Design a protein around this ligand. Sequence first.
Ligand SMILES: Nc1ncnc2c1ncn2[C@@H]1O[C@H](COP(=O)(O)OP(=O)(O)O)[C@@H](O)[C@H]1O
Ligand SMILES: Nc1ncnc2c1ncn2[C@@H]1O[C@H](COP(=O)(O)OP(=O)(O)O)[C@@H](O)[C@H]1O
Ligand SMILES: [Mg+2]
Ligand SMILES: [Mg+2]
Lengths: 139, 7, 742, 371
Amino acid sequence: FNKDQLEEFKEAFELFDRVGDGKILYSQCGDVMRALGQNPTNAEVLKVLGNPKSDELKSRRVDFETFLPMLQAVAKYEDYLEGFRVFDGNGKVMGAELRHVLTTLGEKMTEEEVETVLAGHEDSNGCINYEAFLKHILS
Amino acid sequence: WXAXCPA
Amino acid sequence: ELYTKYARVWIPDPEEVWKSAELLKDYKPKVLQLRLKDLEYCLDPLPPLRNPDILVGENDLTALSYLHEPAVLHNLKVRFIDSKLIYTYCGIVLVAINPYEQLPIYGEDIINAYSGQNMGDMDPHIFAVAEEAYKQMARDERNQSIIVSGESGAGKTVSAKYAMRYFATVSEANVEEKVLASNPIMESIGNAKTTRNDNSSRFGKYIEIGFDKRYRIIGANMRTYLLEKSRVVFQAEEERNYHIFYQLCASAALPEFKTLRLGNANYFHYTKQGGSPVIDGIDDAKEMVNTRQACTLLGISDSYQMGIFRILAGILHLGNVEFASRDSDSCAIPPKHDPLTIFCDLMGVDYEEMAHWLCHRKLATATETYIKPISKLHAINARDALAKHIYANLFNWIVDHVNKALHSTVKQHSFIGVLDIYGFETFEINSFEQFCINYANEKLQQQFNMHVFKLEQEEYMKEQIPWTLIDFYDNQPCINLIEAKMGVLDLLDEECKMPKGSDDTWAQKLYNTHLNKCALFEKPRLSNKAFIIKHFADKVEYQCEGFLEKNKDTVYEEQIKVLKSSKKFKLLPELFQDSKEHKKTVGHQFRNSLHLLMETLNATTPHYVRCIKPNDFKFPFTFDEKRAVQQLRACGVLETIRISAAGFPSRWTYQEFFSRYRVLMKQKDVLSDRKQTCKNVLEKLILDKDKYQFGKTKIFFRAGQVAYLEKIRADKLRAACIRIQKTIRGWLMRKKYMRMRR
Amino acid sequence: TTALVCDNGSGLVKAGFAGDDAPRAVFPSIVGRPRHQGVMVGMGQKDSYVGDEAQSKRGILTLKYPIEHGIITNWDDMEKIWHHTFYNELRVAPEEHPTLLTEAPLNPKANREKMTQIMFETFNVPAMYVAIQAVLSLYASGRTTGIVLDSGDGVTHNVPIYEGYALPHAIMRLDLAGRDLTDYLMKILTERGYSFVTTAEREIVRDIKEKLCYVALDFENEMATAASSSSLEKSYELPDGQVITIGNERFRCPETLFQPSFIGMESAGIHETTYNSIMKCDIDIRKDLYANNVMSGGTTMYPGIADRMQKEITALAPSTMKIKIIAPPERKYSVWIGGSILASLSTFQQMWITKQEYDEAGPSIVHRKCF
Ligand SMILES: Nc1ncnc2c1ncn2[C@@H]1O[C@H](COP(=O)(O)OP(=O)(O)O)[C@@H](O)[C@H]1O
Ligand SMILES: Nc1ncnc2c1ncn2[C@@H]1O[C@H](COP(=O)(O)OP(=O)(O)O)[C@@H](O)[C@H]1O
Ligand SMILES: [Mg+2]
Ligand SMILES: [Mg+2]
């Protein structure tokens, strides 16, 4: 990553500061990394944060300069397609089954998160084009 | 028998 | 060998036959650390291993991946306590645990809900086996019979109620009402109170449900076997003779009986012996009225009901008759004696003629006739043989009138039969009655062990792979040991004859003949008095004490002729109405009768129902580990588990496996004939076919291979799913940026 | 399959199946032959008669016994008596069934060998055994301690047995028996002027002996009494309706078992032989032998003989001892009955001398295995 990207990332980072010290929370680090184009697992985020304790995750604040080595470390299709074919064989996926597995298996999401990802992807029958959902989530 | 008696 | 840290494992606890543990550190290719109040543990040159919980609570026990007494024991506990599901399957076997609480489950809805339906497809219920029996009687004309087995007190009779009620609905005639009304008759004559419960069954009972050429029920036939005649004379402290005596005795006041001149049960030698007349929690006194209702509804006229009770008053009065001895050689009844006087007027014979024939044995040849006096012990053994000869004929005649009412006047095409017989047994005294019970259970479990082997061989011959992989436990050396000539019954019959004979000299002959010869017989350390048989379930120790006096019958033809002449009432000549059979000893009569039963059932396909009584105190709907284990051993289930466990316990169909493990798929996994896909795919996945056989219908795995396939299923599932959640959070916060930045 | 159980006395044949209550065929062990030139051409011809046929025809016949003094003494007629018993009396093929044969305790050892050889060669009996009479009386009388006294038509013997050990040196045989009572009865009957000379006429006497004779409790008192009155005297009919009348002459024959000098034996007489058989036994046993005395065999049937035995033996035994006599009316059968028991016991199946084991070993085997 070049200096310009780092400047753009710092500006974005400062936009997410809801406390005014030019910093985000450890618990916001994952959100900022994903918002900046990274796709780390929650496990990867906790690992790069150093498995922080609840208190520093919720209240310790870091500026862009301390964030940066972590962003670098986090930064450094066919599997995703097979992953979608897991949940299919007409190229569609039930909304109910994907909803159940995403909210009860793996890295369970909130109903609001799931409603925001799935909004607009199910048809009147309740079927999702997973190739289309994938293109959407890759956009 | 064979001696002391008739049978 | 692989067990991770945080696997779970089972360890013997003193008062729970297993306890679950986790293992706190990884075991390595002899010492262990576990979490449970925290302990080290140890090995000999493993513990059992615990099924992944999804398998726990499954209805078929052979579905489980690891099979050992813990896995069955808790799986049955969770089904019984948590899910309330009493019925469970192993292989073909059905296993039942009585709630002592009524349930919806027997309702008519459920009856219809099972009809027609293949054995896997429902959840288990007693109706499901009866339905299979019925449809086998459909597919082949051959008869199908149902075998109901277990401890005294465990709902064998109730399971029969349901097994009949299923046919009564799914098959008009009364027969369900008639048979259900029969029970208080047979339970009055044939059931008894014993140390571990009252209302045990002492005989074994078999009902045929009969069908026409289109399988409408026509009617039914009642048979009895294995009657415990020996109880009638002699008993051990806690016990009663059969209920009908006590019910009759309890009604001494009532006017119809009043001429029978009865007495409080302590008054009569046959009832008196146990000192224990009262059943706890139920008075018998009014139960006669329920018996007499059952008889009358079932068609015994009030005259014959009065006859039946008159005879029973006869037998109880007979027991009080008394012998006083002139000599060792000879004994005479005292000159004026109340019970024999009463006995005569009850049964209409000359007092002096019974007084003569009790006292003497006649002996006669073609030319000549002789009268022998006999000793006090012989006069007693004569009276007791006579009492048993009256009683077992009275029983076998009441069974015949119940049969008259229950038969149906049409040619029967085929029949389905329901058998109520009492399970293999252990008590902490064991006596010739138990020796007979355990002999019978030996034959029955042979029939099972061989029929199972047949059905497994069949299921193999559905399939390309051969039988030889199977081996099975074999009862025959024990059967011979008891049964066959110069065996533990045979020497008992011989000791009756040999001029002076006793439980001691019998035991001595037992040891001389067998003690060091054969692996199945053992002497205890601490006495000559007793011996141990290693039955298939367990070593049982039986006392020799009292085998002889219980073993013995000899009826004097010239006594029974006195009764057979009688003119007062028309039952008593009919009982005798009818050779060597007068000679036979009880043990030989039981051998014969068990062979009648066993050829009745060998001709006929069995089906099996166990009962395992969950707790001694009859607390409702609650379980004890220790009893349940003992029952499951005594029912051969734990043996069957081990045998399958080193077998090929697991079955899958191609469809069921492939449809479940599509989670494992990648497109080379799929080729249009699913059989080839599975058979190719597995070749990389697992070390060899030796773990996993293929048939034409089915896929057969060794034990434990399920738990591995489950683990790789979960591993690939989360490998895909967390990477998907990784991208879904990734983009969803990409979009949160683009929405927040704009 | 069941064991035939057979007894050859001197006097009778007693036969049946093991586990019968009583014997099924009884008949005299007697073979008849015609004394005469048969007159009528076209009558049936009988070359000989066996058993109770000869008893019917007897007035025409010589009657011979193939056994006397418990010894088989002419074989080709004894073989005929067995052939009659198996084929005609019991109606069995003997080749299917095993057999027991019965014998007096000391008799010549060749007797066992030939008695074996006939069974195995002639009939192909499956297996066989030979058993001492006074043993089988204990089985019948339900005891394992006692002194048996057993007296046949042809032999008398004590045997002491104690808890199932037979005690060989104890065992003493007399040859007094009902036959020599019978001959002596003919010789005394001549004194009152009746002469019963021929063989069938001997059997006519033998029925007198069976019916009228009784044992004097005191010999001297009744021998005076018969002079003193008619009262003892009693009378009987010959087959032809002659009457014969008999006095002290009827008890005096039983008395020859107590004073063999009347017959001219040298030996003690059955009471004193019984007491001497006890004394030859050990002092520990003796109190229990005195407790059980078992009369066996037909000769013991005489009225009062048990009360005589007790009275006379009392004067020999020590005053304190309990001495007791056992006398079931069965007793004439009791030697068969004991065999009926013995052949049924499952332990016994080890004992049968089998056709294989004989055919390998030869009839010497009967000495070794059987006793
Ligand atoms: N399936 C069941 N449903 C309801 N009650 C039962 C059941 N099984 C057993 N019982 C109870 O336990 C007893 C079992 O039957 P019972 O005839 O007394 O003994 P068994 O049938 O074992 O010989 C019944 O009296 C009843 O109280
Ligand atoms: N009731 C009797 N009283 C006296 N003597 C008898 C009686 N019955 C048979 N005898 C005689 O005793 C002999 C029969 O005794 P038995 O026991 O049959 O001999 P065995 O056992 O050798 O055949 C014959 O001599 C017969 O005449
Ligand atoms: Mg019952
Ligand atoms: Mg004799």
